[PDB]
Amino acid sequence: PQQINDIVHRTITPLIEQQKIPGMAVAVIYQGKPYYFTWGYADIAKKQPVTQQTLFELGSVSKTFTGVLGGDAIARGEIKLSDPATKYWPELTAKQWNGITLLHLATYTAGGLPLQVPDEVKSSSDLLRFYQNWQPAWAPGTQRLYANSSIGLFGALAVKPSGLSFEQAMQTRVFQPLKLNHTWINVPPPEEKNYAWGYREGKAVHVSPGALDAEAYGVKSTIEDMARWVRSNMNPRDINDKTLQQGIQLAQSRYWQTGDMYQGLGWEMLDWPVNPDSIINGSGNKIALAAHPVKAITPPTPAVRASWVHKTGATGGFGSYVAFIPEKELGIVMLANKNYPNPARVAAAWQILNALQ
């Protein structure tokens, strides 16, 4: 339908020009079906254009994969969200960890875990020392403070019963069943040809290694795989793998309320129809990174199909966004090789999906 083409070109074209994005890929999901768009260059210098094969850094959109992998392990009976973090990390003996559960880690409510794992942390002993000496600001379950060190630790612990590394657990239990065949945490040598460069202040960059990077911001993927990721999270019931179907549903359950937003595992949700000012303003880092009081939802609300489900992600050189509405079979993936302001991403997505409603 040419309607989709129209609304996308009228929305994304000025976005690209205004934000000076070198390359971009967009998928709209309309009635379940993907429609693809690509602009500009994956590699400016070599004049390599963006394609449907082009790999982008997803940044914190990675956390949605981490949430779903966590859900899958719950469904496997390997972990429970109410389990204490120390149950999977006996060497973590510090006083302050007593009441902190997996749920808290996964939902940024452990009590003030920092945004980033410190650059100094470069070994297993370094990472233990980091968490051993960490001193919470608040009691568990009182404040949401968005943080890589929180959901990152959730991911590393959640796979401990499987006996597999986070990376292999993720590939074998999530990517592979969903045929995300060009989705990587570590881009192998034959695929690096497809790996876009990111651009920051004019320079070409790739995300640097860091502790817990795989769990928090380390996934790379194509627009096609990302379209498949969205369709899967929109309709888990059409997936063969039953623990994965169940994990997908657990990640969209509502564990907390703050303002108009509900916290899932990785995913964040709002009731649909949604107030556009709310998600646009909410996505800006002055709000998104701020500490906010939370309201426990007990029992956690089963995945609500009348939802706006969504996640932003950034690295130094990349900016990504994913949003969908299960009840409407409507969704969008935006991948760009420049990190541009979150509210601009959400405004563009809103205007596209609102026109298609």
User: Is 253 an annotated catalytic residue?
Assistant: no
Q: In a 3-state reduction of DSSP, which class is residue 106? A: helix
Contact 301, 286 (CB under 8 A): no
Sign of the Cα pseudo-torsion (13, 16, 20, 26, in order): negative
Bridge partner list, 154: none
SS3 assignment for 211-263? CCHHHHCCCEECHHHHHHHHHHHHCHHHCCCHHHHHHHHHHCCEEEEECCEEE
Burial of 204 (0-12, 13-18, 19+ CB in 10 A): middle
All residues at 6 or more sequence positions from 196 whose CB lies less than 8 Å from its CB, including other chains: 23, 42, 43, 50, 54, 55, 56, 57, 318, 337
Q: How far apart are the first and last CA of the chain?
A: 14
Residue type, position 302, single letter: P
Question: Six-digit token pair at 91?
Answer: 């060497």
d(CA 255, CA 264): 6
Q: Give me the catalytic one of 60, 232, 253, 283.
A: 60
Among 350, 253, 356, CA closest to 296: 253
Strands 307-314, 295-301: pairing kind: unpaired
Phi and psi (nearest 5°) for 160? -60, -40
What single-letter DSSP state applies at residue 101?
B
Residues belonging to the active site: 60
